[PDB]
Subunit: 332 residues, 3 copies
Amino acid sequence: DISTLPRVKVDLVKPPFVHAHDQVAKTGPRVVEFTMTIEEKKLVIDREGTEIHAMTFNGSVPGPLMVVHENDYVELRLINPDTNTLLHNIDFHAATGALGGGALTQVNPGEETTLRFKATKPGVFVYHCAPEGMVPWHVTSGMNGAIMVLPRDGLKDEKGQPLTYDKIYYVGEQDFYVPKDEAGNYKKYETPGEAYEDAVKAMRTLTPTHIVFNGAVGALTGDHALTAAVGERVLVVHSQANRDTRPHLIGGHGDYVWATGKFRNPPDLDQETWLIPGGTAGAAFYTFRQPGVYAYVNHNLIEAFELGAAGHFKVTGEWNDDLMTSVVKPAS
Amino acid sequence: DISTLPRVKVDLVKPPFVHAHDQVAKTGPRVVEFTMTIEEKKLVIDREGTEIHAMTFNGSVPGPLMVVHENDYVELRLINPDTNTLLHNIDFHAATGALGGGALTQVNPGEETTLRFKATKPGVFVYHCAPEGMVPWHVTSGMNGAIMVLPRDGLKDEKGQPLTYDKIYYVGEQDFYVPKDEAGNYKKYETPGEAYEDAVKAMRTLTPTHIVFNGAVGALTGDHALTAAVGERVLVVHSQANRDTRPHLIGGHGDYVWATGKFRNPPDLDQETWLIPGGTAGAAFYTFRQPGVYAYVNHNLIEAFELGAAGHFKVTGEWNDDLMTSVVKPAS
Amino acid sequence: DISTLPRVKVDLVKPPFVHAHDQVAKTGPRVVEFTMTIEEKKLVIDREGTEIHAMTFNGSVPGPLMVVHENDYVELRLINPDTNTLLHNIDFHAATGALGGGALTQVNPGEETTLRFKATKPGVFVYHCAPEGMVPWHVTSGMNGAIMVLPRDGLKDEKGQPLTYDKIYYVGEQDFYVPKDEAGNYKKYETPGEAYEDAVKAMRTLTPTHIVFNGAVGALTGDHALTAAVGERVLVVHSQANRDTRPHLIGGHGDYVWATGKFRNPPDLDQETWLIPGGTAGAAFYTFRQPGVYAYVNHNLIEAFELGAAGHFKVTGEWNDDLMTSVVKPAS
Ligand SMILES: O=N[O-]
Ligand SMILES: O=N[O-]
Ligand SMILES: O=N[O-]
Ligand SMILES: O=N[O-]
Ligand SMILES: O=N[O-]
Ligand SMILES: O=N[O-]
Ligand SMILES: O=N[O-]
Ligand SMILES: O=N[O-]
Ligand SMILES: O=N[O-]
Ligand SMILES: O=N[O-]
Ligand SMILES: O=N[O-]
Ligand SMILES: O=N[O-]
Ligand SMILES: O=N[O-]
Ligand SMILES: O=N[O-]
Ligand SMILES: O=N[O-]
Ligand SMILES: [Cu+2]
Ligand SMILES: [Cu+2]
Ligand SMILES: [Cu+2]
Ligand SMILES: [Cu+2]
Ligand SMILES: [Cu+2]
Ligand SMILES: [Cu+2]
């Protein structure tokens, strides 16, 4: 009887950060309430000033990570304000039935809806918009995110001992297919609707023009680099709603990796690089052992360094010469 | 001594259906006899009426699923009637030696041959045509299928308890590379041979023009949708002979997945999406919990919704509001 | 205290062969010393005489396999002679910190450097050049290889019993992106530097013009085919520094496969085809059961047979009719 269950309202935060939560559940099952507002907005995605009409959950690409526990109920109030122009909905890969909620959440501009589903399977899962007949257009315009459903007793290693993370980040990787004129310059449009048929042609090439973390080339760099300290245990959740990716931490590893993101399976150990299939979220756990700059990339290095799929960690602490040292610095 | 073993003749059925078989073996090892006839035929693959010269085992794309048990012998009579124009053969990934039977099964039009091999490894495996110097052309013209080699005691879960399916379907996913003129219209040819050099150029782009389940855009929809009932246990065998795919059941999961299809390994649990590498067959087990329409797709959603890699299940039975419910229907 | 550890100098050999080593460690931890010389050289990559300016470790594509044990120290003297024109460095995916050694090994022509790192994780790992701002160009010009870090007690199967290989081969798979003029003919340049901007455009298509094993179309064929005998246990290490691949032994299997190459995980059994993500090394163990020619391919068969990703084994010994036999040879 759902009426006798506690409700808890969560306010979401912008990626790559994640809302506050407990790893090990401190309560019985709850109805966890979330609200998201759909925003269609102009987004500048590269250093050249290329602009697209992005379609977002809550103003960000990706949409925010939602965190619950196994056998909680998720109740999502989804709002499409009348400032938008398109019909939208939501499909949770975590949910069972009705096209993941897609059949039940069709909202025109000016409408809202509330969906509830039981989180029966633990893991990280993609969610994404999926309106009838324009599914890939919405998804590849940025309308996707992820939800993590923790087991009620937290994460476990391959022997079933606890794994406790100190920090968690969410990296959403996005393939864009910006239409091009005859010479190869990116086209500009006043509304999303204008772009529709050129978008379809661009997608059909199967060749993205940009592949980015957190909505833009260089988004997870500089002042916006992810941070950690030597000794910290970090969980990186990574999603790709449409296309395969292969994350790699340059200078590090994935100590424990759920590459297809489902926590009832044991993790793969000591990964250099792992494959997250399109339409999947994965998760990797690493303990930092050396300070400095690390690059986190899609290890198709063209996709990383030319198309944009690269971010940085900056890690503080003490250098360990046992692990690595320059014996003779570069010299004639 | 093979002469003292029982023989059993099996008549194959059209995909997505699968010939009758026992999961748990009710006999000792047998020689299982199959016959296939090669058909070169014109196939219409999309709603626009695009036509290719398909090369088929038994008239279908994919070829039919063959089902045996571990340590049976498979004896295949392969017929190439003199109405065809090309040399063909067969390579079973399930078999050991002679290029999977390819070296021993070269048949010109008007010839036949009988191959026998022992099924030593349990799993689902691709089979495909592979004639010297035109391997990808034959395969990507539809000349592939799969064979399932069940363990003699049926399938097991990750703890080794029995898994029994109530229904089984075979989804063959096919990448086509239809040649195009300068403007981008699909070309037409009178014979397969005419197309050869344009086919090679089309393949080399590595960009398929269509990606389809069961031989055509929309083949597993409408009257041809796959069916099940709430509570039923369904095994979907999925093959791709040439290119990677990432299946996903929209509104469902892969409860138990052998993504690379080999049953001595434990299955991955609770998958949202899984990667089947090109040249592989995989298998996914799901128990339906909600009625309605489900879409089964390649979750590169461009490949699904624009290029054709999407089918439907229609599931009958009772709606469970505990799992999912609309709390507030879409409204102003 | 590293000064009290034995040192051992290893001389590397050309791929596909691998330097001599012990599977089970016969000594305690050592400092293993290697030397590599960077060579920029003109390479002919196909039968048409297409030429590129390759960038190599030790003169080969791939660079040589290095073999150590878990918790050895690797000490690499890296030399960039003043006959080269570019700045180079090295990133080991096996190492921890400083961008895998990349931050510490930047050498202009005429410089050398010595790096030491501790091999803390067992597996096969990619190494590759990664200079600031031209990472994919160097990697996709051939500047990559792999290192294997054996567990001190050798390899184990999925039950933890020993697996001992009789032979080991290293297959490096390389994606090239040779620039093309308007009509589609490959361009030629006098220096590597000349090619830079055309290279970037070619890479951005994400479409390789060639995909080869060991540096050229047909390199592992004819007199250069890999060899084995029926009954032998063979380990094939396969790396791809930039793009996904899906190896398959035609006529065989991967009996034990570490597709993402990390030996603390149990192997997948009985694989037909397996996925090695870009930026990864994997390893497959097979025991030959039939003599003859086997083709080892990337099972995107366009990539294999049209673009070059195919090699051969030639296996000697006795034919086993129990496993496979022609019952009726091809006939009218
Ligand atoms: O500015 N909204 O697409
Ligand atoms: O747009 N909410 O009524
Ligand atoms: O679906 N492309 O990885
Ligand atoms: O194909 N996805 O990198
Ligand atoms: O679901 N992969 O851990
Ligand atoms: O009509 N046969 O290709
Ligand atoms: O074509 N059969 O003899
Ligand atoms: O081989 N293409 O997935
Ligand atoms: O690359 N296959 O979707
Ligand atoms: O072979 N994969 O279960
Ligand atoms: O000939 N050296 O690029
Ligand atoms: O190039 N070595 O000094
Ligand atoms: O990154 N391409 O497989
Ligand atoms: O996408 N690599 O075959
Ligand atoms: O790391 N894969 O065995
Ligand atoms: Cu939308
Ligand atoms: Cu989806
Ligand atoms: Cu054929
Ligand atoms: Cu094959
Ligand atoms: Cu270099
Ligand atoms: Cu790397």
